[PDB]
């Protein structure tokens, strides 16, 4: 019954709104302007970066950074904090996916461990355009060029995310679509170490039926969007793995920079 | 209409049968299954290799193990020889996909360059089971144990394929399904260096529509088979990436000596 699939779609969309503070709808409204209510301050260099901690609420350093927690690292631990935060949000969203909390605890943990980062990059695309990315709840916007101008290692941490974002955004998905897609990503019965794969795939199949119907009704004129979106699932994997390696480089060149335990545990990955 | 889609499907199936030596239906009959007659020669150890190598359609080297071209190397070369053949067979199959030859010539070469490995591992599964892989037109069978028992470098060359195969085969696809799938793989669109992506994605869209109808008519009881198969592309991509990795290592294993020239040409890296 397509009626049950539509109900599942509403339910997941409802929990998504309740779980994530910055939706794509709000992100796009901020990025496309035509507003005076929520224009973001733009960080495109050191100066604007310095001033940035004056317009928005940031817990870092405004002045010089060379001999005092450099700008790169300063911005790195910023993402680190937001990431750890996105993990708790995604975890809260996961619990709302029918059947998720009824699964083996070890598997719930495993699904989150391998799914969180893939969800993070998928949603991060909502905050991006070819020129940059929204930061701190959308009050700021950090230019793509500025990020690429960071120190050797950090300078290329985001470039691959932008490349993925521009392609992914071309699909023109809205929040109601992403809510089901994100749920599909989580219930991947092919994650390493899964104990009971069958119950997991039974849920994903239900979610896939919901996603398919949702895309057919929401994008009547977009042929094979469903297949096209599912293929994007391969780009995420690449992003994640790619991210992991670079992370290993940081650890060796920045033995003074710390990583949050949570994030550190989720990698043992890949 | 569902008429052009069934025609497309039939067309690819025919071409697929004509282009490849052993069909999955055939390989299955031979593998786990009686079909008691002309049982394949089994390679399970060094001695069994030597015997088969001298008692089977082989064209390369002879069984000589004594500080010269170790066993593992001889097996590796055998896989390469068959791979060079598979490349030509996949190239012909590609030319039969409607619209393929009509694409920019450079794009055709690009699509084959990046899709051959994905296709090889995908079709390889048709010849694999959890205990081994059919070799030499199915005239042989090389056990999983034997392959894994090989040295540190070559021993972890086929195991990841076995794991992939095991999962992939659980989908119970047949030759008519795989024929369309392989075509989807070839008409990607995200291959680097492409010059005119539009016609490529337009063909894949047509191929995906044909694949979906095919799976729905051929596996009416298999819910969301289409979606599950598409997500398997994320597995292949990883396998392939991981494959060039071990390949780069072999390069740093065998190189020097004025022997093997022109042969290195025929192969290079594929
Ligand atoms: C799915 C629920 C909503 C999630 C919102 C995620 C916001 N985010 C995503 C992009 C990102 C950038 C950097 C990341 O790197 C790390 C190593 C964290 C330092 C990681 O998460 O593994 C990870 C993720 C991100 N947040 C920020 C803030 C400032 C600059 C860059 C940046 O990137």
Per DSSP, the residues of B200-218 read: HHHHHHHHHHHHHHHHHHH
Cβ proximity of B240 and B117 under 8 Å: yes
A-proximal residues of B, 33-62, CB under 8 Å: none
Domain region containing B171: 1-270
- A188: CB partners within 8 A, 6+ apart: A111, A114, A115, A200, A204, B231
The three-point CA angle A81-A86-A90 to 5° equals: 155
User: Two tokens at B242?
Assistant: 């991981």
User: Two tokens at B167?
Assistant: 């999962």
* B167, B209, B241 ranked by CB distance to A190: nearest: B167
Cβ proximity of A136 and A96 under 8 Å: no
Cα–Cα distance for residue pair A165/A161, rounded to 1 Å: 6
| Strand ordering across the sheet containing B140-143 | B41-43, B140-143, B132-135, B128-129
Using a CB-CB cut-off of 8 Å, the residues of chain B touching A237 are 234, 237-238
Strand partners, A42: A141
Cβ proximity of A178 and A15 under 8 Å: no
From the CA of A84, how far away is ligand 1's center (Å)?
A: 9
Q: Å resolution of this model?
A: 2.1
* A209, A224, A237 ranked by CB distance to B205: nearest: A224
- Classify the C-alpha dihedral A24-A30-A32-A37 as positive or negative: positive
Instruction: Give strand ranges (E) for chain B.
Output: 41-43, 128-129, 132-135, 140-143
* A223, A234, A237 ranked by CB distance to B205: nearest: A223
Cβ proximity of A16 and A28 under 8 Å: no
Cα–Cα distance for residue pair A69/B23, rounded to 1 Å: 62
> Is A23 a pocket residue for ligand 1 (Cβ < 6 Å)?
no
The CA radius of gyration of chain A, in Å to the nearest whole number, is 19
**Looking at ligand 1, which residue's alpha carbon is closest to its atom 3?**
A86
Q: Report the domain count for chain B.
A: 1
Would you call B212 and A227 a contact, using CB atoms and an 8 Å cutoff?
A: yes
The binding site of B for rosiglitazone comprises: 80-83, 117, 243, 267
Check residue A207 and report its DSSP letter: H
Check residue A101 and report its DSSP letter: G
A-proximal residues of B, 189-208, CB under 8 Å: 190, 205, 208
> Is A260 a pocket residue for ligand 1 (Cβ < 6 Å)?
no
Nearest CA in chain A to B205: A224
Among A227, A235, A240, A241, the residue to mutate for chain B (most B Cβ within 10 A): A227
Cα–Cα distance for residue pair A215/A194, rounded to 1 Å: 29
> Is A259 a pocket residue for ligand 1 (Cβ < 6 Å)?
no
CATH of the domain at B144: 1.10.565.10
Backbone φ and ψ for B157, nearest 5 degrees, come out as: -90, -40
The three-point CA angle A207-A268-A259 to 5° equals: 105
Cα–Cα distance for residue pair A206/B101, rounded to 1 Å: 39
> Is A178 a pocket residue for ligand 1 (Cβ < 6 Å)?
no
Would you call B237 and A233 a contact, using CB atoms and an 8 Å cutoff?
A: no
The pairing of strands A140-143 and A41-43 is: parallel
Cβ proximity of A249 and A257 under 8 Å: no
Atom of ligand 1 nearest to the CA of A82: 26
Cα–Cα distance for residue pair A157/A78, rounded to 1 Å: 13
User: Two tokens at B85?
Assistant: 């053949």
Cβ proximity of B72 and B49 under 8 Å: no
A-proximal residues of B, 138-167, CB under 8 Å: 167
> Is A96 a pocket residue for ligand 1 (Cβ < 6 Å)?
no
B142 in helix, strand or coil?
strand
Strand partners, A213: none
Q: Which residue carries 């799914």 as its tokens?
A: A115
Instruction: Give strand ranges (E) for B56-202.
Output: 128-129, 132-135, 140-143
Say which experimental method was used.
X-ray
For chains A and B, count residue pairs whose Cβ atoms are closer than 8 Å. 41
Q: Which of B191, B252, B206, B245 is nearest to B9 (CA)?
A: B206
Cβ proximity of A196 and A203 under 8 Å: no
Using a CB-CB cut-off of 8 Å, the residues of chain A touching B209 are 223-224
A107 in helix, strand or coil?
helix
Cα–Cα distance for residue pair A128/A106, rounded to 1 Å: 34
Strand partners, A140: A41, A135
Burial A219-231 (b: 16+ CB within 10 A, else e): beeeebbbbbbbb
Atom of ligand 1 nearest to the CA of A124: 9
The pairing of strands B132-135 and B128-129 is: antiparallel
Using a CB-CB cut-off of 8 Å, the residues of chain A touching B167 are 190
Cα–Cα distance for residue pair B139/B161, rounded to 1 Å: 20
Cα–Cα distance for residue pair B247/A39, rounded to 1 Å: 51
Cβ proximity of A60 and A70 under 8 Å: no
Strand partners, B246: none
CA end-to-end distance (rounded Å), chain A:
38
A134 in helix, strand or coil?
strand
Nearest CA in chain B to A197: B167
| Strand ordering across the sheet containing A128-129 | A41-43, A140-143, A132-135, A128-129
Q: Is A231 on the interface with B (CB under 8 A)?
A: yes
**Looking at ligand 1, which residue's alpha carbon is closest to its atom 31?**
A79
User: Two tokens at A263?
Assistant: 């994030």
**Looking at ligand 1, which residue's alpha carbon is closest to its atom 11?**
A79
């Amino acid at each position: 019954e397509s009626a049950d699939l539509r109900a599942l779609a509403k339910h997941l969309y409802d929990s998504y709104i309740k779980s994530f503070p910055l939706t794509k709808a709000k992100a796009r409204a901020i990025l496309t302007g035509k507003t005076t209510d929520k224009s973001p301050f733009v960080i495109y260099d050191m100066n604007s970066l310095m001033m940035g901690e004056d317009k928005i609420k940031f817990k870092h350093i405004t002045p010089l950074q060379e001999q005092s927690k450099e700008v790169a690292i300063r911005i790195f631990q910023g993402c680190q904090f937001r990431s750890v935060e996105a993990v708790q949000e995604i975890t809260e969203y996961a619990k709302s996916i029918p059947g998720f909390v009824n699964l083996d605890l070890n598997d719930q943990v495993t699904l989150l461990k391998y799914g969180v980062h893939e969800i993070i990059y998928t949603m991060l695309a909502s905050l991006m355009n070819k020129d940059g990315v929204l930061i701190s709840e959308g009050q700021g916007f950090m230019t793509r060029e500025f990020l690429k101008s960071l120190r050797k290692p950090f300078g290329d941490f985001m470039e691959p995310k932008f490349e993925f974002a521009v392609k992914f955004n071309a699909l023109e998905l809205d929040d109601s679509d992403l809510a089901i897609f994100i749920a599909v990503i989580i219930l991947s019965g092919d994650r390493p170490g899964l104990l009971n794969v069958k119950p997991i795939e039974d849920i994903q199949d239900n979610l896939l039926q919901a996603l398919e119907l949702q895309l057919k009704l929401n994008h009547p004129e977009s042929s094979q969007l469903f297949a096209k979106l599912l293929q994007k699932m391969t780009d995420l994997r690449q992003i994640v793995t790619e991210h992991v390696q670079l992370l290993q480089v940081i650890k060796k060149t920045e033995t003074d920079m710390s990583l949050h335990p949570l994030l550190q545990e989720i990698y043992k990955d890949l």
